[PDB]
Every structure is written in C-alpha cells, then in structure tokens.
Amino acid sequence: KEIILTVWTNGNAIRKYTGQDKTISKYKLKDWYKATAVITKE
C-alpha cells in the first residue's frame, strides 16, 4: 500500500510539512521546498 504525505524537504533531508513556508519573514530557506511524497514500504 502507498501513503501520500505532504513533506518539507531539501532533496536530501525531509520532514512532515507543517506550514514551514507560511512565515511572515521576508526570508526563506534556499534549498527547502514543499512537496508531495508517495511513500511505499520496502
């Protein structure tokens, strides 16, 4: 079975998306972005 999880990742590390891009700051991380993960257990 597959799990679809919205993630906050930089291509290497990865975390669950909790709204990291929902900031009032003028700045943001260069390498990190919001993405969708299709997770398949091996």
Next chain:
Amino acid sequence: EIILTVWTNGNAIRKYTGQDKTISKYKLKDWYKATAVITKE
C-alpha cells in the same frame, strides 16, 4: 523529481540512515524503511 529512501511511520518522516539496524532487541512498532517519490510544489 527525486526518489529518496526514508525512515517513516506514515506520519513523521526522516531521511533513512539505517535506523532499523540497531543492537537492541526491540524496535518501533509503526516505523519502517520505505521509498518516497518526492515531487516539488
């Protein structure tokens, strides 16, 4: 798009670094090694 090996329980997720290769005789019930297809935006 990238294909990452991850350590996750279906809710929280981390990059897989061999978290399941421990000396303990116990393991987390819900966590497992998985393949994650990451699609930007």
